[PDB]
CSV table of C-alpha atoms (C1' of nucleotides) and ligand atoms in Angstrom, one decimal:
chain,number,residue,atom,x,y,z
A,1,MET,CA,62.4,87.5,82.5
A,2,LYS,CA,62.7,86.9,86.2
A,3,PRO,CA,59.1,86.7,87.5
A,4,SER,CA,56.3,86.4,84.9
A,5,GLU,CA,57.8,84.4,82.0
A,6,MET,CA,58.9,81.5,84.2
A,7,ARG,CA,56.0,80.4,86.4
A,8,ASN,CA,53.6,80.3,83.5
A,9,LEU,CA,55.3,77.3,82.0
A,10,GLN,CA,55.6,73.6,82.8
A,11,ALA,CA,58.4,72.0,84.9
A,12,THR,CA,59.2,69.8,81.8
A,13,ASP,CA,59.8,73.1,79.8
A,14,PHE,CA,62.2,74.2,82.6
A,15,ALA,CA,64.6,71.3,82.0
A,16,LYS,CA,64.8,72.3,78.3
A,17,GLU,CA,65.4,76.1,79.0
A,18,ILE,CA,68.1,75.1,81.5
A,19,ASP,CA,69.8,72.7,79.1
A,20,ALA,CA,69.8,75.3,76.2
A,21,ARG,CA,71.3,77.9,78.6
A,22,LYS,CA,74.0,75.5,79.7
A,23,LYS,CA,74.9,74.9,76.1
A,24,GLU,CA,75.2,78.6,75.3
A,25,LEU,CA,77.4,79.2,78.3
A,26,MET,CA,79.8,76.5,77.1
A,27,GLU,CA,79.9,78.0,73.5
A,28,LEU,CA,80.8,81.3,75.2
A,29,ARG,CA,83.6,79.5,77.1
A,30,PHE,CA,85.1,78.1,74.0
A,31,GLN,CA,84.9,81.5,72.3
A,32,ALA,CA,86.3,83.4,75.3
A,33,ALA,CA,89.2,81.0,75.7
A,34,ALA,CA,90.0,81.4,71.9
A,35,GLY,CA,89.1,85.1,71.9
A,36,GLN,CA,87.8,87.6,71.8
A,37,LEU,CA,84.4,87.3,73.5
A,38,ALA,CA,83.0,90.6,72.3
A,39,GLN,CA,80.2,90.6,74.8
A,40,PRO,CA,81.3,89.3,78.3
A,41,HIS,CA,78.2,90.4,80.0
A,42,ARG,CA,76.0,87.8,78.2
A,43,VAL,CA,77.8,85.1,80.2
A,44,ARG,CA,76.8,86.5,83.6
A,45,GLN,CA,73.4,87.2,82.2
A,46,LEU,CA,72.8,83.7,81.1
A,47,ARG,CA,74.1,82.6,84.5
A,48,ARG,CA,71.4,84.6,86.2
A,49,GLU,CA,68.7,83.1,84.0
A,50,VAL,CA,69.8,79.6,85.0
A,51,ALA,CA,69.5,80.5,88.6
A,52,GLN,CA,66.1,82.0,88.1
A,53,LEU,CA,64.9,78.9,86.3
A,54,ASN,CA,66.0,76.6,89.1
A,55,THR,CA,64.6,78.9,91.7
A,56,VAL,CA,61.2,79.0,90.1
A,57,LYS,CA,60.8,75.3,89.4
A,58,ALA,CA,61.9,74.9,93.1
A,59,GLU,CA,59.4,77.4,94.5
A,60,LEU,CA,56.5,76.2,92.3
A,61,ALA,CA,57.1,72.5,93.0
A,62,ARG,CA,56.8,73.3,96.7
A,63,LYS,CA,53.9,75.7,96.3
A,64,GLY,CA,51.9,73.1,94.4
A,65,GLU,CA,52.5,70.8,97.4
A,66,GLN,CA,51.4,73.5,99.9
B,1,G,C1',174.9,149.0,94.7
B,2,G,C1',178.4,143.9,93.4
B,3,U,C1',181.5,139.6,95.8
B,4,C,C1',182.4,137.1,100.1
B,5,A,C1',181.1,136.4,105.3
B,6,A,C1',178.3,135.9,110.0
B,7,G,C1',173.3,135.8,111.9
B,8,A,C1',168.1,135.8,111.8
B,9,U,C1',163.5,134.7,109.7
B,10,A,C1',159.6,133.4,105.6
B,11,G,C1',156.4,130.6,102.2
B,12,U,C1',155.1,126.0,99.8
B,13,A,C1',151.1,120.6,102.8
B,14,A,C1',151.4,114.4,101.0
B,15,G,C1',148.0,114.3,104.5
B,16,G,C1',145.9,116.0,109.3
B,17,G,C1',143.4,119.4,112.7
B,18,U,C1',139.7,123.3,114.7
B,19,C,C1',135.7,126.4,113.0
B,20,C,C1',132.1,128.1,108.9
B,21,A,C1',129.3,127.2,104.7
B,22,C,C1',126.6,123.6,101.4
B,23,G,C1',125.1,118.5,100.9
B,24,G,C1',124.4,112.8,101.8
B,25,U,C1',123.1,109.2,105.1
B,26,G,C1',119.6,108.1,108.8
B,27,G,C1',114.8,108.3,110.9
B,28,A,C1',114.9,111.1,116.3
B,29,U,C1',111.5,115.1,117.1
B,30,G,C1',106.6,117.9,116.2
B,31,C,C1',101.7,117.4,113.9
B,32,C,C1',98.2,113.7,112.4
B,33,C,C1',94.7,109.0,112.2
B,34,U,C1',92.9,104.6,109.2
B,35,G,C1',94.8,101.0,115.2
B,36,G,C1',94.7,99.8,119.9
B,37,C,C1',93.7,100.0,125.4
B,38,G,C1',91.0,100.0,129.7
B,39,C,C1',85.9,101.2,132.3
B,40,U,C1',80.6,101.2,132.1
B,41,G,C1',76.4,99.5,129.9
B,42,G,C1',74.2,96.2,126.7
B,43,A,C1',73.8,91.1,124.7
B,44,G,C1',74.9,85.8,125.4
B,45,C,C1',74.8,80.2,123.3
B,46,C,C1',75.9,77.1,117.9
B,47,G,C1',75.3,71.8,116.3
B,48,A,C1',72.8,65.3,112.7
B,49,U,C1',67.9,70.7,109.4
B,50,G,C1',75.6,69.1,109.4
B,51,A,C1',78.3,73.5,113.7
B,52,A,C1',82.7,75.9,115.2
B,53,G,C1',87.2,75.5,111.4
B,54,G,C1',88.7,74.2,106.7
B,55,A,C1',89.7,72.3,101.4
B,56,C,C1',88.6,73.0,96.4
B,57,G,C1',86.1,76.1,93.5
B,58,C,C1',82.9,80.7,91.3
B,59,G,C1',85.3,86.4,87.9
B,60,A,C1',85.7,89.2,80.6
B,61,U,C1',91.2,89.7,82.9
B,62,U,C1',91.8,87.0,89.3
B,63,A,C1',97.8,85.8,92.3
B,64,C,C1',96.0,88.1,97.6
B,65,C,C1',91.6,89.6,100.4
B,66,U,C1',86.3,89.9,100.7
B,67,G,C1',81.3,87.4,99.3
B,68,C,C1',79.5,83.1,97.5
B,69,G,C1',78.8,77.7,96.8
B,70,A,C1',78.1,73.8,90.2
B,71,A,C1',71.3,78.1,91.2
B,72,A,C1',78.6,79.9,93.1
B,73,A,C1',81.3,88.8,94.2
B,74,G,C1',75.5,85.6,93.9
B,75,C,C1',68.9,83.4,92.7
B,76,C,C1',63.2,84.4,94.9
B,77,C,C1',59.2,87.4,97.6
B,78,C,C1',58.4,91.4,101.1
B,79,G,C1',59.7,96.2,103.3
B,80,A,C1',62.8,100.8,103.1
C,101,MG,MG1,146.3,117.3,98.5
C,102,MG,MG1,89.8,82.2,98.3
C,103,MG,MG1,72.6,71.9,92.0
C,104,MG,MG1,63.0,94.7,95.9
RNA sequence: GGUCAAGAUAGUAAGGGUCCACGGUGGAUGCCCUGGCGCUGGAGCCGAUGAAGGACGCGAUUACCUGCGAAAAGCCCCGA
């Protein structure tokens, strides 16, 4: 989830959540390219999550150096 | 009436012409606005914190355009 769930965790946990998300996105690319990709949306959704992650760990890393 | 004779005149149009009817072509005309034009008034700088302008990308499907920039038709908080 966008706000809550992210900030509560460590910047070393972010790297992990990122990585796993990357991997799922690639799985979905293989599937899609082979067909069918029953749930397209998930792709975009995962994308968003990645963004959120990198936003948070950015924000936080600069708020802990405020 | 019939034969002959002398004389005169008609219709048929292969194609054309004038007019009428009915179409085709074509895009004038009328109506319209999603686009412009001028005037007045406002507002007036951007850039090494990387500009103006681009290239290549980002889409479930994406060639063009728009928006964006590997956090890629978008991510965070605030306000409506
Ligand atoms: Mg004829
Ligand atoms: Mg383009
Ligand atoms: Mg990056
Ligand atoms: Mg909001």
